[PDB]
Amino acid sequence: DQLTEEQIAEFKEAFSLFDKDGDGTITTKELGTVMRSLGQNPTEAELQDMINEVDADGNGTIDFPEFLTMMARKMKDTDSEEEIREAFRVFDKDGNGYISAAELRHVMTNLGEKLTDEEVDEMIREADIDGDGQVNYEEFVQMMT
Ligand SMILES: Clc1ccc(C(c2ccc(Cl)cc2)[n+]2ccn(C[C@H](OCc3ccc(Cl)cc3Cl)c3ccc(Cl)cc3Cl)c2)cc1
Ligand SMILES: [Ca+2]
Ligand SMILES: [Ca+2]
Ligand SMILES: [Ca+2]
Numbered sequence: 226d227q228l229t230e231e232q233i234a235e236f237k238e239a240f241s242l243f244d245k246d247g248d249g250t251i252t253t254k255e256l257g258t259v260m261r262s263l264g265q266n267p268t269e270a271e272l273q274d275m276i277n278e279v280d281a282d283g284n285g286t287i288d289f290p291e292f293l294t295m296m297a298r299k300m301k302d303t304d305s306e307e308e309i310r311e312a313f314r315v316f317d318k319d320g321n322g323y324i325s326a327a328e329l330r331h332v333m334t335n336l337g338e339k340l341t342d343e344e345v346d347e348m349i350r351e352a353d354i355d356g357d358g359q360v361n362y363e364e365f366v367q368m369m370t
């Protein structure tokens with residue numbers, strides 16, 4: 226089938242979270258910044274190894290079609306569940322088990338991202354299956370699939 230404009234917009238927003246300077250490519254330095262904000266501490270060589278798996282043309286960076294190719298592979302690492310829980314803990318800064326729009330705003334400002342209130346509210350709505358206005362652990366996990 227064909228992607229909708231909403232699906233293209235969602236892929237574009239996800240790419241922009243890594244592409245901090247907006248030049249259309251994701252570098253090892255930009256990938257490292259995101260991973261550190263989600264509780265990880267990869268070395269530069271490990272970041273290069275991760276990019277190399279996705280980088281098809283071999284120019285050291287990830288472009289939009291390479292990013293989409295990555296998503297279409299449904300690839301996973303051995304400690305995926307631990308990394309997803311670690312990332313979940315980062316967002317839920319008040320320890321109540323729900324990620325609020327305020328807590329998502331906190332992680333985005335720490336990452337150096339500039340997002341409007343409508344963009345933050347749409348990200349919550351995108352993941353909020355039960356409709357309580359916040360993202361619980363199961364919704365945060367389901368979002369990854
Ligand atoms: Cl905790 C977690 C688990 C899985 C993923 C997915 C994924 C899904 C959607 C999107 Cl928009 C980007 C990546 N996934 C697919 C491939 N890589 C490998 C790597 O994941 C790095 C990573 C690991 C752990 C954590 Cl906590 C965050 C990240 Cl970004 C990676 C991610 C983004 C780019 Cl641009 C390039 C690479 Cl190689 C991860 C992401 C986070
Ligand atoms: Ca970039
Ligand atoms: Ca490339
Ligand atoms: Ca919370």
Ligand SMILES: [Ca+2]
Pocket residue numbers: 352353354355356357358359360361364
């Ligand atoms: Ca919810």
